[PDB]
Serotransferrin (Homo sapiens), 338 residues
Amino acid sequence: CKPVKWCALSHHERLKCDEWSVNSVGKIECVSAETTEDCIAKIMNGEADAMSLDGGFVYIAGKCGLVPVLAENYNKSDNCEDTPEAGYFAVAVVKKSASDLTWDNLKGKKSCHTAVGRTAGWNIPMGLLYNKINHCRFDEFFSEGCAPGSKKDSSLCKLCMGSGLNLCEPNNKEGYYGYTGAFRCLVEKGDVAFVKHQTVPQNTGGKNPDPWAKNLNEKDYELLCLDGTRKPVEEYANCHLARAPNHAVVTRKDKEACVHKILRQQQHLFGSNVTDCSGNFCLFRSETKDLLFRDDTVCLAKLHDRNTYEKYLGEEYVKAVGNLRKCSTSSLLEACTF
């Protein structure tokens, strides 16, 4: 069991893993690979033992026989490490005042996305719209919109609000970037916003004091259901697109107990309760951003029932990511699905 070999996919990740390794006094060791898929392959063949992956890669890793064993939890609580979070629900929000707007006729409408490539703002809705997309041209489905990160001259930059050269940039200098930004986009310019289930409630009724949000009313918005109907934003349960999971640590099934034990001890040592991270090693802090784990991680929580990809990932989520893979394929996925 000792040591658990962690796989790093960047120079900065490897540096952090090196630091972790010596601080762990050999309970953790480091291996590098060029890309995420190369790391997954190393875990499959025993050259590495574990890494943390986003939902799309938990899917690929699972098709390859690896299992998720810990969820990254992002919220504080007294039972964090024994209580894995389920993530959030991606939703499509429209104005109640909008006439004739449903899931079935989004083609050619005006869209607001958190950013290109984001799970709630792009991957989930585009993956579910797949059947109506022509030749993988996701950027040609809507007439125009704001999807920060798009090409400066794309129809999906037309609605963005960034001043100067910040226009359509995937960062906070672009006003329509992010969950709150995409909702602002809906309120100000667009027809539909792709956000998550907390977004409207947290940005209405004064909960967000910013001028654009402070006087909004939750009742002015509705959700688009996959069946073509609409519901109030409070009723996302059976009117959402897909459940987006937290990132998960994956490993070979026969290393599940080992990884549980070692990582629980590691987070007790170096996790979110470390009082002074200045100069000291902290597992969930990064010199840049989100190295090895998301910087938002509070703890790694043991999975019980949801320790397979099919149980960890939502059904519509798997459909969405599967469809995206039809437009951007993976040699690893191919090798594993034969």
